[PDB]
């Protein structure tokens, strides 16, 4: 369960000063200093308690992307088809694209790594657009060809210059950034909820689906017809499976009350299991667990369930932060008068600001 019985942090009782100086002397493993910082962070995260900037747009939030570089710029997607490009700390009226509203949900959005004036999108209209924030397409990377077939889930890798989309039937297309198809094989039997290719290994794809599996693939090696590398079975449908920065470890978030870590030295079987309510609801965007870009932590929206075996006696609509080696609650984020079920939660590139898709709202958590 534990990724080595705790990365226990440094010198007697570990005051950061004591730890930092130790690091200075050569006497301190970086991974130790790391943990010390992580703790120092976890502490500042308790005073993050302030939502410094909140906003909506309409319909419901469905996709969240942090600008890869600016620690203020955030993109947000809507069940309607809305795209907000919001740089808070500027007070400048976010760039806006209004979508269909009917179908047209943005089921996935990543910024265009090669040009951040553009983004990619997984639309319920049945298209994966590459589009400018000043609302105009450049090239539709994939369109459906049958109605009722649309796409749910993106990634995209600057490094290998690839684009992957999962449709709602189980098909996964893989494109090069010009737009040429290399894939199409039906990798999953049902809706592909989440597609994510490895940050540290260009050709190492993880695909999660409603078929209650997460699949791991090699693109350069195994193009050869729906015959992956690993398939991970789950108690329920999988809402998301995304890699840790550095590519070792995968964070699986199932549809009911289970989050899993899968190690790179395995992949096949889970490292641990974190039990954590997040359930399926009607007009609720599926909860997804995510990594903190820097420290070894996990963020999730808790969604209290009278049937889930609560360890804690107090069960609120809190934003949960788990250890990630221990697997155990490092703290909760909760603003009465503002909190509700937080579907999506992503940290900055820098991990000093927390963006929360709170169903209908967008919340920005920052230290005083």
């Amino acid at each position: 369960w534990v990724g080595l019985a705790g990365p226990q942090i440094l010198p007697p009782c570990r005051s950061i000063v004591r730890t930092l100086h130790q690091h200075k002397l050569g006497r301190a493993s970086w991974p130790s200093v790391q943990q010390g910082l992580q703790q120092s962070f976890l502490h500042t995260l308790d005073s993050y308690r302030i939502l410094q900037k909140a906003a909506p747009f309409d319909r419901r939030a469905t996709s969240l992307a942090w600008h890869p570089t600016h620690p203020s710029t955030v993109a947000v997607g809507s069940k309607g088809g809305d795209i907000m490009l919001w740089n808070f700390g500027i007070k400048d009226k976010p760039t806006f694209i209004k979508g269909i509203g009917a179908g047209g949900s943005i089921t996935g959005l990543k910024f265009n790594p090669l040009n951040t004036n553009q983004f990619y999108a997984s639309s319920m209209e049945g298209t994966t657009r590459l589009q400018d924030f000043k609302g105009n397409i450049l090239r539709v990377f994939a369109s459906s060809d049958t109605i009722n077939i649309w796409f749910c889930s993106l990634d995209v890798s600057a490094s290998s210059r690839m684009v992957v989309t999962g449709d709602n039937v189980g098909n996964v297309i893989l494109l090069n950034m010009d737009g040429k198809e290399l894939w199409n094989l039906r990798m999953h039997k049902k809706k592909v909820t989440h597609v994510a290719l490895n940050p540290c290994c260009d050709w190492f794809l993880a695909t999660a689906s409603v078929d209650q599996t997460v699949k791991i693939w090699d693109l350069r090696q195994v193009r050869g017809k729906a015959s992956f590398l690993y398939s991970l079975p789950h108690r329920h449908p999988v809402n998301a499976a995304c890699f840790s920065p550095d590519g070792a470890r995968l964070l699986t978030t199932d549809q009911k009350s289970e989050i899993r870590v899968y190690s790179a030295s395995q992949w096949d079987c889970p490292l641990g299991l974190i039990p954590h309510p997040h359930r399926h609801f009607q007009h609720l965007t599926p909860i997804k667990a995510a990594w903190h870009p820097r420290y070894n932590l996990i963020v999730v929206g808790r969604y209290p369930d009278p049937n889930f075996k609560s360890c804690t006696p107090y069960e609120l609509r809190t934003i949960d932060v788990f250890d990630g080696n221990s697997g155990k609650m490092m703290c909760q984020l909760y603003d009465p008068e503002s909190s509700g079920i937080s579907s999506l939660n992503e940290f900055n590139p820098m991990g000093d600001t927390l963006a929360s898709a709170m169903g209908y709202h967008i919340l920005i958590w920052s230290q005083e």
């Binding site: 007697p12 009782c13 005051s15 000063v17 500042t44 290994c201 590519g247 070792a248 790179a264 395995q266």
Partner: protein, 1140 residues
Amino acid sequence: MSYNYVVTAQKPTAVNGCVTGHFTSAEDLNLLIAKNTRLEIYVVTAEGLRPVKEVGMYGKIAVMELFRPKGESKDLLFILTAKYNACILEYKQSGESIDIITRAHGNVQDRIGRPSETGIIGIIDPECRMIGLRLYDGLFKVIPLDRDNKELKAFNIRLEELHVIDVKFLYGCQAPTICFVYQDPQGRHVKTYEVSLREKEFNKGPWKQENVEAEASMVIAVPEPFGGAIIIGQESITYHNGDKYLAIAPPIIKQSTIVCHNRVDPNGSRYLLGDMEGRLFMLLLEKEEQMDGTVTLKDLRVELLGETSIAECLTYLDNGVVFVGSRLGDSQLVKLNVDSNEQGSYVVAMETFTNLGPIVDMCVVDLERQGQGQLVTCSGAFKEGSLRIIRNGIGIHEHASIDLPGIKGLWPLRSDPNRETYDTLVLSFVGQTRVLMLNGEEVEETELMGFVDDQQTFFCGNVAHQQLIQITSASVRLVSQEPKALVSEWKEPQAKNISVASCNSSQVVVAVGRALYYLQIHPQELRQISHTEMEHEVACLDITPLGDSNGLSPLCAIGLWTDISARILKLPSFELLHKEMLGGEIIPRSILMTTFESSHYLLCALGDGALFYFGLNIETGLLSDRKKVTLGTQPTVLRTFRSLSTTNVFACSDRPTVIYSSNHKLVFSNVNLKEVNYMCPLNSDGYPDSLALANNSTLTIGTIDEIQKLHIRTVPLYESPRKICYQEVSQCFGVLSSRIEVQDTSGGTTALRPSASTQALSSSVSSSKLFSSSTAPHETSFGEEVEVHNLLIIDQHTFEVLHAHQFLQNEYALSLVSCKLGKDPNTYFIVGTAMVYPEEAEPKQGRIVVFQYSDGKLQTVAEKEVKGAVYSMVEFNGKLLASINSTVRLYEWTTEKDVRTECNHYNNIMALYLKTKGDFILVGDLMRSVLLLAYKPMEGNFEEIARDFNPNWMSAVEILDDDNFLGAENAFNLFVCQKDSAATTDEERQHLQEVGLFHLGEFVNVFCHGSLVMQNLGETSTPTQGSVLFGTVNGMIGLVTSLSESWYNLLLDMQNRLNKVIKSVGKIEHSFWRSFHTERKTEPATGFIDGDLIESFLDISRPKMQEVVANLQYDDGSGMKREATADDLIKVVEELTRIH
């Protein structure tokens, strides 16, 4: 723009592991030390170590193991880099050529996976069947070493034991059998497996498993006669053979943890145990011969042998000689005893190998003669805690030194005409001359006949017709070699004294008041051939023959007294061929003509220590290019020696210097010495190719360094040294020390062992009452047992570095910053305190305390309580800028001498590092990269200008100019940031772009400006622009420099060609080695150049040299392009070495 140059001044001095075996020969016992990127190979002689080869590797040496495969006449070397470069290496000597050849090599890294917290572990099968490594958690890496596998291809085994503490291969089992301590929720346990290359998986060891002492760190493989494993921890040592278990818990371990072990006896009888306190224990395995069933282990016993320096590893060599690989202090070589002497010491330091590491802080100071520069003072740290004073120059190695004060001149001499060498050294004092006969290395006061010693000698030496000459004040004496006899004597006709002399092999030019006589040396004959008078008094003379001159100089150089001129006279006649006005008032003190690289010069030094020099034409006696240098306030006396075939000039003054030429311009290497008044080359039987050097008190015979070198002094503190700064006004250094004390049964404190602040006549303790303690003593880190920090400020003098005053801080204050300053009154020492309670992770109670020092009295002047932890402070335009925690405060100092809160900046997480330039402020925020702030006056507040995006865990930070910013992070990389301004209201000018990456390989505390070399105006060359020196945790101390756009490209190109040549020492590609590396990122590396590649240019064959220069279009400053030659680059790299 933004081009950078990184060049290693110094070189890591810390030992990161040392291994023993038969690498070089087989009959040889070798010791191999790893420094970081450096591999040092030695042979163990009866008396010490003999250095055979030091190699540099494009990697940080992580695993270094010797092993002997069957059918190999010697031990091979296995190296693993921290970037996962693996290689097998072999010693080869081609008669006289030393070569390390890459047998097998590859990059064994997985394509995924996070390094274990405990780091890389490498072990080799006791039968060299395979290599086994632990790179990541839950995998065991195996390289099939057996048979021909040359790319070092490797497979992995899944390792259900996730958290591995230590692995080692067991001795004597029917399969490769691995033994390890691991950790699970149950505690720590020892388990064993078998490795089959055959099927590629574990199989199960000779015993299922055991519970192991709670804190078991070491796993020792015991050799054949026993065959078990020793497991060391705190408070316990255990033997496990597999069925057999035997353990002891000797009381004398409970003081500190055992860091390192080492086998003494090939059978495994005894083991050496290095401590952490710096102890050394002998482990003894009790052999019990039973009767038939033969050797069995009876018992374990440990005995303290005594204290070494804090050991990172050790290997016993032989004859009771041990090598101590220290990283915290000086590594050493020690002798062990059978019977312990006074104070129960079996251990005696034989040799102390100096180590600068860690180096927590350092500053640059101008101390010796103040003429730039040039010394660095650094740090420490624990009982190994020291101050290191490091300065650059040509060192002298003394071989004899006599207390013989007031020498007024020195001359070598060959008394024996049949002898090639010198045998006599003549010295002159105010009263007279004494003669020193050199026998062996033995000097001997005799006399030679024909030489008087009534009065002072101005010159003497071997001369023309197998004769000796002695020009005294009174006369000119010419002595005959065979029968030493006065053979001819010249005196000033009217019985006056000679006031100035000069002499070559066959000509003499003395001077009386104004008068000049030119004499000639002939058999038995001191033939006067010329007599003139000068405009004013004669200051000094030279008649050195230049070039194709038959020891007979056509010219005569002379300095004049009141008009202050250095003029060339046509010798034969005294025909004034060129006058030269020098300066006002100060009388010239030494003049000499000389040939540098077949070009002829006239140097001329004055009584204030100002040296002029000209390009003298031998034909017209024409002086050209008057260049002027100051070098120390003593009248500089000039002299000559011969360096190889090449001839240099020694500049005898309070700031001694040696001048030579490299291309056609002359270079001033600073001589590493106190005053030197006079000097002469002495090539004695007993002193070959040596120098006689006389200062005010001491004659010295010695050998001069071939090239400018770099040189160190130690000042031990027995305290961790922490922060340091120089208060030039009160002629004083201020150092923040800190000592480990043990919590007592009553109130805590109490040191172990006296240190710099315990031995402290004149010491103080501010008992400032501003804090309020807890009612019940919250003693954490043992409520009555274990250690406490205890931090004071100390004052070291300057010269002599006796410790002036010691001062104990708030008692629990950790104190993190030091400062010498002003804002109106006097020069203060300001200390930014911490206030660390065991116990809380976050600190929330600062203190800035202002001090004023004089006469050993150190007075707490002012004070300001802060609500955090003052991480750094800077003198800023008169104010005291301080990072407290998240916050950056400005602080002002008004009348009533209190430090008063001016404007703030709030937006940071850590804010550990500050560096200002003008009104600009660089901030290293540990938890989120770095940021530029401005103080705007006309305004009175802080304004964020730019933040670097991408979040760097920086080690230290530095400004290079108001546009470029330097960072080093936990990844041993360097990064450079950028300013700008961007069009139409929207600013990327707010984005500190990062424009330079480079994987250093070292960890940098402290950057700081200043240099170790003296810099030259007009001449030299400007591939160098800036100078930022930096301290490493391994004691390596490189410098970075601002390069030309033009220059950068050339060198960038150089590298690539240099890379095509140069047998890399494990076929590690340099570009890879340097390329910027994180656990998540790996990028090529731009904007930087490593001098270490550039400098290794001067170390290849002239063919390979011409190969690199082939096809190269070079600009030699003429603007008109030309084909570059090997020599053009040699004088370019030659120059670049002379910048540290």
